[PDB]
Amino acid sequence: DVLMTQSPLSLPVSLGDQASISCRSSQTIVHSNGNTYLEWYLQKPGQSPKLLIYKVSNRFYGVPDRFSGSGSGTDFTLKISRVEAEDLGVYYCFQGSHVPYTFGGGTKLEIKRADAAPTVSIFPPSSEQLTSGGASVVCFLNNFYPKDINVKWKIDGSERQNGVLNSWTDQDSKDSTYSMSSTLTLTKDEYERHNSYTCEATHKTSTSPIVKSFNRNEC
Amino acid sequence: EVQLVESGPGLVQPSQSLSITCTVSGFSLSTYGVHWVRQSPGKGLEWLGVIWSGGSTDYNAAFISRLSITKDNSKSQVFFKMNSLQPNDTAVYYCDRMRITTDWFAYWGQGTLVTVSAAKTTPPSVYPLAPGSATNSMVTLGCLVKGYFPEPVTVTWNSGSLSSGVHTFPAVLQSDLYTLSSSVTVPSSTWPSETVTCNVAHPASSTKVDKKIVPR
Ligand SMILES: *[C@@H]1O[C@H](CO)[C@@H](O)[C@H](O)[C@H]1NC(C)=O
Ligand SMILES: [Cl-]
Ligand code: NI
Ligand code: NI
């Protein structure tokens, strides 16, 4: 199979600026018939992908002239000349030249904004859940930028990896920030055997982590 | 004047097969190929296969052993059939025209979400997330929605009237059931006097639950 290597994975831009997305193929994708079936697709959240560019450089019906595809051989480029709000989403290259046909890994086109630290909130398990024999500790990390963040859980000073589930929102349409939930699920027995619970967020905005914690005995 | 409509099951038991019908309009299957693509949750697009105007097929190498595409030219139908589905075949499956040659019929199906699971219909447990003892202008509250199947649930706050400063996170699998949370940030100048209530609906179980968030 022809591997399509698409970079960058993520591409922050301000509205009005130009975006450039690269697609490299592991071999040439010129067909025997002389055509190069290199296609660019845009997929928005909850929608089917839509064709923008076909045969390397031809705009599909309805596609604005701000979208321009170029390249040849093994190196291809999509340029969006003055990025608008309707252009945000994930871009994929596709080769239809040699079976099996293959997609690039995608490029998320997103809004560049000022770096913002997360607002971190930690929640002990509710009395209602505890009554049921479960114990979930929830941490929200809200309205931060950029999206890159690392969250560590510590229980009595020791990092926990088992039973942590993370979920991330898409970039917010209003303020262009990202949010995240991190949830540690334990048995009630496990929960009651430890004292200190900490959600620790390391983000670009501070060299020191944001540390939110509670002590079970202080509840 | 061009669309592709899909019919298939939303839920498949592990080890059972998946059949999807793609019904095309605005172009002829006797002249154009139709492709199948899927997208696993939070992953990129993967090409699965194609059925060409003349009836021959090509497949992604990882699916040759269990995928077959067929069609009916006169009825504008294309049939996707895949065997031995496992949980990691959960995906949105698309039929579409791509590898555009002489035409402008590059349209996609709306896609068929297929979940592969042995789980039974299970309503969520809903737990309030209220501030632990620990005072700026805003307070963050939430609801934890745990242990439901299938997707989706819908979460609103104060019956939809509180929409600003809500983040409802995508659901994740915990064993074979789904969990999510929703956070809402509200002014400390109005809470708790002005009440805040998450409303959780799970249509599959006909569950509608209200959880009022009160101070601990
Ligand atoms: C994941 O996919 C592989 C084939 O790539 C399959 O053998 C395995 O059973 C699948 N596992 C689950 C848990 O779905
Ligand atoms: Cl064709
Ligand atoms: Ni321990
Ligand atoms: Ni406490």
- Return contacts of B48-54, CB within 8 angstroms, 24+ apart: B48/B80, B48/B93, B49/A100, B50/A99, B50/A101, B50/B99, B51/B78, B53/B29
Q: How far apart are CA B178 and CA A86, in angstroms?
A: 32
Token pair recorded at residue A213: 């914690």
**φ, ψ of residue B75 in degrees (nearest 5):** -95, 5
Find which of A35, A108, A120, A123 to mutate to test the B interface (most B CBs within 10 Å of its CB).
A123
Task: Give the residue from chain A lying closest to B134, CA to CA.
Answer: A214
A147 with A104, same domain: the answer is no
Q: Are residues A162 and A196 in the same domain?
A: yes
For the domain that residue A133 is a member of, what is the CATH number?
2.60.40.10
Q: What residues have their beta carbon closer than 5 A to ion ligand 2?
A: B 32-33
The shortest C-alpha distance from B17 to chain A (Å) reads 23
Give the domain-ending residue among A63, A98, A113: A113
Residue A39: what are its φ and ψ, rounded to 5°? -125, 145
- Number of folded domains that form chain A: 2
Q: Which residue of B has its CA nearest to A171?
A: B167
d(CA B6, CA B16): 20
Spell out the CATH class of B119-213. mainly beta
Alpha carbons A101 and A186: distance in angstroms, whole number: 45
CB A40 within 8 A of CB A53: yes
Annotated ligand binding at B167? The verdict is yes
The CA-CA-CA angle for residues A47, A103, A180, to 5°, reads: 55
To what resolution in angstroms was this structure determined? 1.9
**What stretch of H or E contains A179?**
strand A178-187
Helix (H, G, I), strand (E, B) or coil at A132: coil
Q: Within this chain, do residues A90 and A122 fall inside the same structural domain, yes or no?
A: no
Closest residue CA from atom 1 of ligand 1:
B88
Ligand nearest to the CA of B86: 1
